[PDB]
Design a protein around this ligand. Structure first.
Ligand SMILES: CC(C)C[C@H](NP(=O)(O)O[C@@H]1O[C@@H](C)[C@H](O)[C@@H](O)[C@H]1O)C(=O)N[C@@H](Cc1c[nH]c2ccccc12)C(=O)O
Ligand SMILES: OCCN(CCO)CCO
Ligand SMILES: [Cl-]
Ligand SMILES: [Zn+2]
Length: 657
C-alpha cells in the first residue's frame, strides 16, 4: 500500500473538525508535547530544522577534521566553528576583545566623530540608528539602490515602549542593561543605573518616531526616493558624509537612495544634534555590548539569554554550545555550508510538476473571477505568466576569498565575517542585477516570494515530509507543499504584491472599480482576523488579538494557497473519484494536510512577541481561519450553522477563490 502522508496518531477524537480542525488533527500533540527547555516554539518546522542542524553539524566536523589548506572554505568553516566551541579560550580572553571597538566610541569627542565610529561598527555587524540594506529599485527592477530603514531600539518593536501589553518586559529592560554594563566595566548593576535609564529614555524617543508594523509594510508609503544632497538638507544634524564613508562607500556609491521612513530619518538627525553626545555615547556602548554579548564570557552570555531568551520568549536554558556554533557558521558562511549540504542531501523534477499545476490552477481561477473586470483579469494573467520559479538550490555560489579565519580569534572572525558580507552587498551597487542570487540557503526550512524579480523560491529543505512525500498519495502533498506553493504565488497578488507588475516595478495595473472591490474584500478579511485570540491566550489582559491589518498579506497568501491547491488536486484526478485512505476522502486529506503542517505551539511570552512582530497569523488561525472561508471545507466535513467554525456564505471572503 501507498502511505497516506497524513499522521493520525495525534488526533483528538473529541474535538469535532467542524468545530476545530486544528484541534481535531493536532489535539493530542497540543495537549501533551513538552516544548524543549532551549526553545520557545516547537512543531513541524522545528522538527525539520533539528534534522538539518545535525546534518550541517556533521558537515562542519567532516570539513574540520579534513586537513584542508588554509585559504579554503573547508578551512574557514572548520576553524570558525572551533573558534566558538573552545569555550575555555574565550573565557580566558575575558572582556579584552571588546576593548578596541569600545575605545572607538569612548574616544569620540563629539557628534561628528561618533557618527564615524558608528559607521565602522555597523560595517562590522553592530546595530545603529539607521538600518541599511541593498535591494532593487521599486520603480526600476534593473538597478540596485541603498535603502535606509528605522532602527536604534533594543526591544522587538516600537510598541514595547508604550503599549501596556508589554509593560513587564519594559520594566525589566533597564535592570538588564545595567547588569550588562556591570559585567563589562566592573562594579554592580546599581552603579550603572543612571546609564541604563538614560539609554531607555533615548530609545523611547526613537520608538516614538518609528512607524508601526502596519504602516511599515505599505510599499507606496515606503518608497521615498531621495538624492544624497536632499538627505543632507532634509535630515540635517547628523553627519551623513563621515558616517557613510565609515560604512565603506561614497557620496559617489549611489547618488540616489531609498528612505523607507522619511519623518523618522528627520527626527533621528534632529535628536543627534539636540541630545547630549554623552547620552548618545551610552546608547552606542549598549548597541555594541548587545551585538557582541554571544561572543564573550559565560557570564555575559547567560545574562544576555536571561533577557533576550527567558523574558522575551520564555525559553528556559541556553542552547548547547554546538548549536550556537552552527548558527555562527550559518550567518557568516551559509552559502559555503549550503554547497556541501546539497551534494550530500538532495525529485526536483516532481516539484516542477506541482508548481506548474498550481500555476495552471491560478490561471483558471483568475479567468473566472466574477468580481473584477475583463480588463484587470487580463493584466492579472500577464503577471502570473511572468512568474519565475527557483527550486532546491542556487546556480552560483558566494565567494569567500576575501575572508580570513583564525581558529584562536572568535571575536576577530565575527568582525571580519560581517565586514565581508557587508562589502559584498555594497559592491552590488556598481554592477547590474543578479537574478541567479538566492536570499535563503538551501538548508533553510522556509520559502519566499520576491516581488522585484516576480519569483517564488523553494530551498531543498522544505521539500520533505510533512510537506512533500514522493511515496505518499498526492492529497497530502497538495495540502502541504502544494498549498505552500500556492501561498508564495499568492504573495504576488496580496494587498502589496499586487502593486508590482510582472517585471517587479511599482505600477498601478488596475482600474479604480477593481481597486475598490479589492479593498472591500481586504477590509472583510482584516476584520475577521482582528477578532481572533490565540486559544492559549484567552484569559490574558486585553485579551491579546491578532493584528488583522498586519497579517493581511499573509492571510491572503494562505487563503489563495489552499483554495487553489484544492482546485489543482481536483484537476489532477482527471474525473476519477479520489481514493479513500484511512477513513478519509481525498478532499478531507488535503485539509488534514494543511492542518498538520501548521502543527506548532508557543510559550505565552513568545506568542505575545509574535502577535506584535510576526506578519504570519498564529498557526491555529492559518489552519482554522482559512478553511471557514472555503466552500470545499463545508462540503468535506458537512459543516452547518450549528458548528463553531461556520460562517454564513454571505460573510465568507472570496478573493482569488
Ligand atoms: C508557507 C510557509 C511554509 C513559508 C512562508 N514564508 P513566506 O511567508 O513567503 O515569507 C516569510 O515571511 C516573510 C515575511 C519574510 O520576509 C520571508 O523572509 C519569509 O520568512 C511562511 O509562512 N513562513 C513562516 C513559517 C515558519 C517557517 N520557519 C518557522 C519556524 C518557526 C515558526 C514558524 C516558521 C515564517 O517565516 O515565520
Ligand atoms: O522564521 C521565524 C519567525 N519569524 C517570522 C518572520 O519571517 C518571526 C520573527 O522573529
Ligand atoms: Cl545600481
Ligand atoms: Zn508569506
Amino acid at each position: 500500500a501507498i502511505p497516506s502522508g497524513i499522521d493520525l496518531s495525534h488526533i483528538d477524537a473529541d474535538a469535532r473538525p467542524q468545530d476545530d480542525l486544528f484541534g481535531h488533527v493536532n489535539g493530542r500533540w497540543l495537549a501533551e508535547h513538552e516544548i524543549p527547555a532551549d526553545r520557545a516554539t516547537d512543531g513541524a518546522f522545528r522538527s525539520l530544522f533539528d534534522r538539518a542542524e545535525t546534518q550541517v553539524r556533521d558537515l562542519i566536523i567532516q570539513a574540520s577534521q579534513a586537513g584542508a589548506a588554509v585559504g579554503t572554505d573547508a578551512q574557514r568553516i572548520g576553524d570558525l566553528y572551533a573558534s566558538f566551541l573552545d569555550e575555555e579560550a574565550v573565557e580566558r580572553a575575558g572582556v579584552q576583545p571588546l576593548h578596541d571597538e569600545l575605545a572607538t566610541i569612548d574616544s569620540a569627542a563629539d557628534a561628528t566623530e561618533l557618527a564615524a565610529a558608528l559607521g565602522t561598527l555597523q560595517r562590522a555587524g553592530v546595530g545603529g540608528g539607521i538600518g541599511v540594506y541593498v535591494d532593487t529599485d521599486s520603480k526600476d527592477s534593473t538597478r540596485y539602490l541603498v535603502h535606509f530603514t528605522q532602527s536604534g531600539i533594543g526591544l522587538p518593536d516600537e510598541s514595547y515602549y508604550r503599549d501596556e501589553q508589554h509593560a513587564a518586559v519594559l520594566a525589566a529592560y533597564p535592570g538588564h542593561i545595567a547588569r550588562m554594563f556591570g559585567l563589562v566595566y566592573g562594579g554592580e548593576s546599581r552603579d550603572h543605573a543612571k546609564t541604563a535609564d538614560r539609554i531607555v529614555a533615548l530609545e523611547t524617543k526613537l520608538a516614538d518616531a518609528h512607524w508601526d508594523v502596519v504602516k511599515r509594510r505599505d510599499a507606496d508609503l515606503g518608497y521615498n526616493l531621495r538624492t544624497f544632497a536632499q538627505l543632507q538638507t532634509e535630515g540635517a544634524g547628523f553627519d551623513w558624509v563621515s558616517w557613510v564613508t565609515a560604512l565603506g562607500s561614497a557620496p559617489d556609491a549611489m547618488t540616489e537612495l531609498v528612505v523607507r521612513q522619511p519623518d523618522y530619518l528627520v527626527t533621528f538627525a534632529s535628536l543627534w544634534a539636540s541630545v547630549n553626545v554623552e547620552d548618545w555615547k551610552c546608547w552606542a556602548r549598549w548597541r555594541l555590548i548587545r551585538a557582541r554579548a554571544p561572543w564573550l564570557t559565560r557570564a555575559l552570555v547567560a545574562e544576555d539569554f536571561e533577557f533576550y531568551g527567558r523574558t522575551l520568549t520564555g525559553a528556559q536554558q541556553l542552547r548547547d554550545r554546538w548549536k550556537r556554533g552552527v548558527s555562527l557558521v550559518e550567518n557568516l558562511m551559509g552559502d559555503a555550508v549550503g554547497k556541501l549540504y546539497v551534494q550530500r542531501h538532495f525529485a526536483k523534477s516532481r516539484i516542477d510538476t506541482l508548481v506548474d499545476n498550481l500555476q495552471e490552477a491560478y490561471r483558471i481561477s483568475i479567468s473566472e473571477l466574477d468580481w473584477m473586470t475583463p480588463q484587470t483579469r487580463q493584466r492579472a494573467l500577464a503577471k502570473l505568466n511572468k512568474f519565475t520559479a527557483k527550486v532546491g538550490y542556487p546556480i552560483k555560489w558566494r565567494d569567500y576569498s576575501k575572508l580570513a579565519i583564525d581558529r584562536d580569534d572568535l571575536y576577530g572572525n565575527v568582525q571580519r565575517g560581517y565586514a565581508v558580507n557587508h562589502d559584498r552587498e555594497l559592491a552590488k551597487l556598481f554592477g547590474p542585477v543578479d537574478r541567479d542570487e538566492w536570499f535563503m540557503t538551501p538548508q533553510t526550512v522556509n520559502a519566499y516570494y520576491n516581488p522585484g524579480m516576480n519569483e517564488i523560491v523553494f530551498p531543498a529543505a522544505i521539500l520533505q515530509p510533512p510537506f512533500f512525500d514522493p511515496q505518499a498519495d498526492e492529497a497530502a502533498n497538495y495540502g502541504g507543499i502544494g498549498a505552500v506553493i500556492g501561498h508564495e504565488i499568492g504573495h504576488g497578488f496580496d494587498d502589496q504584491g499586487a502593486k508590482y507588475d510582472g517585471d517587479g516595478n511599482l505600477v498601478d495595473w488596475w482600474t479604480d472599480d477593481d481597486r475598490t472591490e479589492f479593498a472591500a474584500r481586504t477590509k472583510a478579511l482584516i476584520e475577521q482576523y482582528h477578532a481572533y485570540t490565540p486559544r492559549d491566550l484567552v484569559d490574558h489582559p486585553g485579551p491579546p488579538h491578532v493584528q488583522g491589518a498586519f497579517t493581511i498579506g499573509e492571510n491572503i497568501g494562505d487563503l489563495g494557497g489552499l483554495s487553489i491547491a484544492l482546485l489543482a488536486y481536483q484537476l489532477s484526478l482527471n474525473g476519477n473519484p479520489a481514493p479513500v485512505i484511512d477513513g478519509l476522502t481525498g478532499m478531507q486529506r488535503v485539509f488534514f494536510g494543511w492542518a498538520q503542517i501548521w502543527r506548532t505551539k508557543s510559550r505565552a511570552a513568545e506568542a505575545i512577541r509574535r502577535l506584535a512582530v510576526d506578519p504570519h497569523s498564529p498557526p491555529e488561525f492559518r489552519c482554522n481561519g482559512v478553511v471557514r472561508n472555503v466552500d470545499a471545507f463545508y462540503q468535506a466535513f458537512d459543516v452547518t450553522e450549528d458548528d463553531a467554525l461556520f460562517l454564513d456564505p454571505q460573510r465568507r471572503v472570496r478573493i482569488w477563490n
